[PDB]
């Protein structure tokens, strides 16, 4: 019902609000604290008039929080107690977010301690800093405050702030920021235009006092900062009239700040804060977009429309209702600032610190949020406001600039002297703008969005020097790749005739070169060196390295590209060129040739009707793609009755070859037997006939078996299975004793339908999905590697991991579809850790085929019959009401074990990638603990064919009997032979009821044995339970116990030679 859905949305809004708001009792205790702060601040001693340069009157233990780089000034200082104390901010406005509660107090400076010319050469900033220094000294000794600290207000390094927190209990309850402010009408608003000057060049840089030269450059950021203090009380007055009266407007503001918090768009210098949306909602109330009668959800809806549709970098908006002829124009602000907003006083940009890159990225998030808002579906509220979006998980590649001291030289290479003079000495924030624009224009085709990290606001205690710009933090850039345009390895420029070619030569330098093509055009072009798909994915690394060195004098050593470090986990020991996409395509082309060979074969009694592949290789999900092989004659011995080789006793285990299953359906006919075991006979005859014709017409090596035929073509081995359409129906025939024959599902019948019908459909469906998303193969293969490395490969089917990986690309509602393997793997770990498998089935909408009406009906049936379904339920359009891929899937135990491991591995892996230094060991999360297992079995690497696939490379390899030279082979190699898997089958059948075995199929050298606690308890003699159980008489009665000592030597006996040693603990 729509009423139920609306009520659910109302309930979801309310429970979020009560969590994020503050209680009444906390408000009272905060109110008592601020009254105590008011009493303390008003009782402060005064000092006589002193020169600003004279700072010896400061006692030891307190330092000026400004760095005062040009020390010569022209002012005098006097301290007086504050004339007026006013609480400003959002505390009295009723919009405070729970994790961080802050209260702002404005201190009105007396008129008699400030001079008319204090707005020049940072004199006011110096006086304000010394005012806080005197207050910090006198308030430190007071036992009321648990901690007192210095910090930056409004993200400005020239504006220090004072932090006070209470002692003992409630120490995390609230913090108070103390903001000195000038008298209301002290300064002239006309003196603080973006086009006017307030810092003189002779004082800032020159040694001469009146050196003549060019007119003084305007200082818009300096003017904005000075006016920022003068208008502190005005914002609260406007918001009280408009926002305090109407409830629900507060709800929308609170929800929007949570939305900004989740996407990490509020904190840092120049961030889009919750103060800004307070003015944005006021502007919308001024217009007809918002009226005061909506709820909080509608306010969130209305604001998000404005952000996604309005660009503030070209068309600024004004909050000033009055339109005076002698009023500042918006054109001037656009020339001075990247983003233009306005207040009732036109001089206040109010957004002078937010960059164009920041606003574009906020627009990007707003557009994504509107698509979820417009679409009607369940869990949309959870995805919109509760799903975190860190930079590492929202961008395909991240980039680190390790030494920020080099960024100062970038300002020297470029022309930012007026801008460096305007913002004091902050070279980091000055060059952030031009560098992003420089990189954005050079990466236009290969990128969708570029973002930069914001430096955190420092907090340092009294009696320490303030932090420098060099040690502010580390700079990180986020890149959102465009899937189209990554296929090309060239950047196409203009032709050499028209004169904008010279412009192209300027931007790229020596790498710009002349090229001619088949179309007949002479053209300027630049060519990179990228052979594989992975190398083409790292083309922007070459772009950013070349451009930064050429145009910013930033060496390549200062650039750390975090792109595909995980690619080594799905590669060879030393092969970093490709991740395996080229090998998979070659195998697919071989399969297509074989299908065409079947489609045209003559002499068969029944013609071929359908050829379908049912192997992970054909759907690009094989972790290690195969290669064509040529057996060595001397490494084996030969039967000479059949063209089949056998492994030798003295040589090590041969190379592993896995045949790929192909399902073939013949022409329908009515001459087939109606008996279950007789159809098995006809199928076996078809296996023999198919092998005989294939070797006669095309000279292919074929081996016929009762269930399949193995064909060697182009070095690849294919396993061909012939299936009969009505065979599953025959297996369902059950004549009942009363005398009526019916059709009932059977485990054999269900297995046959999965192998011949359901498996080819999923393989073909996932094959098509890879075509739209080239990054699907890397994510899926890496996901299997991590699961199998944690020794939890048993219980997780190959198809189940493919389907959950496909869910990332088909339903990435918070994000965009992944374009790099590393970002998909992080989202895969997040999905496993956070998904509620108990109350939600995973939907994989393969090629649409399901609408919202069918989804809610399936969801309704899911809760009605949850107990009959497995712990993990995956819903596909082909397979609904059941999950055939997880019926034999994970148990309740190992499912929770993976969630714990995934929740543990995610924080350390993201920390490794976000470290400015290189990752210490990318294989840390791929190693198992090896502590909980009762018995550990070690295997000899001589008889492990899949040993190059190990996580830890051994760097030494045995001879496996393969020929390096390509060519044909006249004989069948060894197929599907590995001692580790043969050993596991023997163990899991003899001791399956007693213990559990854990192994890694990719290079595993250890088998973990865990005893079952229930089986080891004494039991009475049951004849069926005497498998390895022995007779005790300690209690005077005959009971059964496992024979631990005899089982251990069975581990050595079974697998003789393969087993190296047996160690048992506890």
């Amino acid at each position: 019902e729509i009423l139920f859905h609306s009520s659910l949305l109302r309930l979801q809004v309310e429970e979020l609000l009560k969590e994020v708001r503050l209680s009444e009792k906390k408000k009272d205790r905060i109110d008592a604290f601020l009254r105590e702060v008011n009493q303390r601040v008003v009782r402060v001693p005064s000092v006589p008039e002193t020169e600003l340069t004279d700072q010896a009157w400061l006692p030891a233990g307190v330092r000026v929080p400004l760095h005062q780089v040009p020390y010569a000034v022209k002012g005098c200082f006097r301290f007086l107690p504050p004339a007026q104390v006013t609480v400003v901010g959002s505390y009295l406005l009723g919009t405070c977010i729970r994790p961080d509660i802050n209260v702002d107090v404005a201190l009105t400076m007396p008129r008699e301690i400030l001079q008319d010319k204090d707005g020049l050469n940072q004199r006011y900033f110096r006086k304000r800093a010394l005012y806080l220094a005197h207050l910090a000294h006198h308030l430190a000794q007071d036992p009321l405050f648990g901690s007192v600290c210095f910090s930056y207000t409004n993200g400005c390094h020239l504006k220090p702030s004072l932090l006070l927190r209470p002692r003992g209990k409630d120490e995390r309850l609230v913090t108070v920021r103390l903001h000195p402010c000038p008298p209301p009408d002290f300064f002239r608003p006309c003196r603080l235009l973006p086009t006017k000057n307030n810092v003189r060049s002779a004082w800032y840089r020159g040694q001469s006092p009146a050196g003549d030269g060019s007119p003084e450059p305007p200082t818009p950021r300096y003017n904005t900062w000075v006016l920022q203090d003068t208008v502190l009380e005005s914002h609260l007055q406007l918001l009280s009239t408009i926002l305090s009266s109407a409830q629900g407007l507060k709800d929308g503001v609170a929800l929007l700040k949570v939305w900004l918090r989740q996407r990490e768009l509020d904190k840092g210098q120049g961030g889009f804060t919750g103060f800004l949306v307070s003015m944005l909602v006021v502007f919308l109330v001024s217009t007809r977009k918002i009226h005061t009668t909506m709820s909080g959800y509608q306010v969130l809806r209305s604001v998000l429309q404005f952000l996604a549709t309005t660009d503030l970098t070209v068309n600024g908006i004004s909050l000033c209702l009055s339109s005076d002829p002698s009023l500042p124009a918006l054109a001037d602000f656009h020339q001075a600032f990247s983003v233009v907003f306005l207040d009732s006083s036109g001089h206040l940009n109010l957004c002078a610190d937010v960059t164009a890159s920041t606003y574009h990225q906020v627009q990007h998030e707003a557009r994504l949020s509107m698509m979820l808002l417009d679409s009607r579906a369940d869990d949309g509220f959870h995805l919109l406001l509760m799903t975190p979006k860190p930079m590492i998980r929202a961008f395909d590649h991240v980039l680190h600039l390790r030494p920020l001291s080099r960024l100062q030289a970038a300002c020297h290479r470029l022309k930012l002297w007026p801008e460096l003079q305007d913002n004091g000495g902050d070279y980091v924030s000055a060059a952030l703008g031009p560098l992003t624009t420089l990189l954005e224009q050079g990466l236009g085709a290969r990128l969708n969005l570029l973002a930069h990290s914001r430096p955190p606001v420092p907090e340092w205690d009294i009696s320490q020097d303030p932090p420098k710009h060099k040690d502010s933090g580390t700079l990180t850039l986020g890149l959102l790749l465009r899937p189209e345009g990554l296929t090309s390895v060239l950047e196409l420029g203009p032709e050499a005739d028209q004169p904008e070619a010279a412009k192209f030569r300027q931007f790229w330098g020596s790498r710009s070169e002349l090229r001619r093509f088949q179309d007949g055009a002479i053209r300027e072009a630049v060519v990179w060196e990228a052979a594989s798909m992975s190398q083409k994915r790292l083309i922007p690394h070459q772009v950013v390295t070349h451009l930064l060195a050429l145009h910013a004098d930033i060496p390549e050593t200062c650039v750390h590209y975090v792109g595909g470090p995980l690619d080594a986990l799905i590669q060879g020991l030393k092969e970093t060129s490709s991740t395996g996409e080229e090998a998979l395509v070659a195998a697919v082309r071989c399969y297509d040739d074989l299908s065409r060979l079947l489609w045209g074969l003559e002499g068969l009694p029944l013609t071929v009707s359908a050829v379908q592949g049912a192997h992970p290789v054909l759907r690009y999900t094989e972790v290690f793609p195969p290669t064509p092989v040529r057996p060595a004659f001397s490494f084996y011995e030969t039967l000479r009755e059949r063209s089949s080789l056998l492994p030798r006793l003295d040589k090590p285990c041969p190379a592993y070859v896995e045949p790929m299953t192909v399902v073939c359906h013949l022409e329908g006919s009515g001459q087939w037997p109606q008996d279950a075991e007789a159809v098995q006979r006809v199928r076996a005859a078809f296996q023999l006939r198919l092998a005989e014709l294939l070797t006669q017409q095309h000279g292919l090596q074929c081996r016929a078996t009762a269930t399949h035929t193995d064909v060697l073509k182009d070095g690849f081995v294919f396993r061909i299975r012939v299936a009969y359409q009505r065979e599953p129906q025959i297996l369902k025939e059950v004549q009942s004793p009363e005398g009526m024959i019916s059709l009932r599902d059977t485990a054999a019948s269900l297995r046959l339908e999965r192998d011949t019908r359901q498996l080819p459909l999923l393989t073909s469906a996932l094959h098509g999905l890879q075509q739209q998303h080239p990054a699907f193969s890397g994510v899926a293969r890496l996901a299997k590697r991590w699961v199998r490395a944690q020794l939890l490969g048993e219980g997780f089917a190959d198809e189940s991991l493919d389907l959950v990986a496909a869910a990332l690309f088909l339903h990435p509602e918070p994000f965009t579809p992944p374009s790099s393997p590393q970002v998909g793997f992080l989202r895969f770990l997040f999905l496993v850790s956070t998904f509620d498998w108990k109350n939600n089935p995973l939907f994989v909408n393969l090629n649409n085929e399901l609408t919202v009406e069918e989804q809610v009906e399936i969801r309704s049936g899911f809760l009605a019959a949850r107990a009959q379904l497995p712990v993990m339920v995956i819903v596909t359009p082909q397979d609904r009401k059941n999950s055939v891929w997880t019926q034999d899937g994970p148990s309740a135990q190992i499912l929770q074990q993976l969630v714990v491991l995934a929740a543990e591995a995610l924080p350390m892996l993201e920390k490794q990638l976000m470290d400015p230094r290189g990752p210490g060991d990318i294989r840390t999360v791929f190693r198992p603990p090896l502590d909980i297992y009762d018995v550990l079995i070690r295997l000899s690497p001589r008889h492990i064919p899949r040993h190059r696939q190990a996580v830890d490379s051994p760097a030494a390899s045995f001879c496996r009997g393969l020929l390096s030279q390509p060519g044909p082979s006249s004989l069948m190699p060894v197929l599907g032979y590995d001692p580790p898997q043969l050993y596991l089958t023997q163990l899991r059948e003899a001791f399956g009821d007693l213990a559990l075995f854990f192994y890694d199929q990719h290079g595993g050298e250890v088998i973990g044995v865990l005893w079952k606690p229930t089986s080891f308890q004494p039991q009475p003699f049951k004849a069926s339970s005497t498998k390895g159980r022995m007779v005790m008489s300690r209690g005077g009665e005959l009971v059964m116990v496992p024979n631990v000592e005899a089982i251990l030597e069975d581990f050595a006996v079974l697998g003789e030679g393969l087993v190296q040693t047996v160690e048992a603990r506890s």
Binding site: T487, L490, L514, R515, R516, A525, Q771
Partner: peptide, 30 residues
Amino acid sequence: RKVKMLKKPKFELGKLMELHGETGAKVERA
């Protein structure tokens, strides 16, 4: 007797390269 094409997907180069199986030539600047 007849097959008609109604809708085509987005043109992708790699799909065609399976069915059918550049940087350019160098010219010296003056």
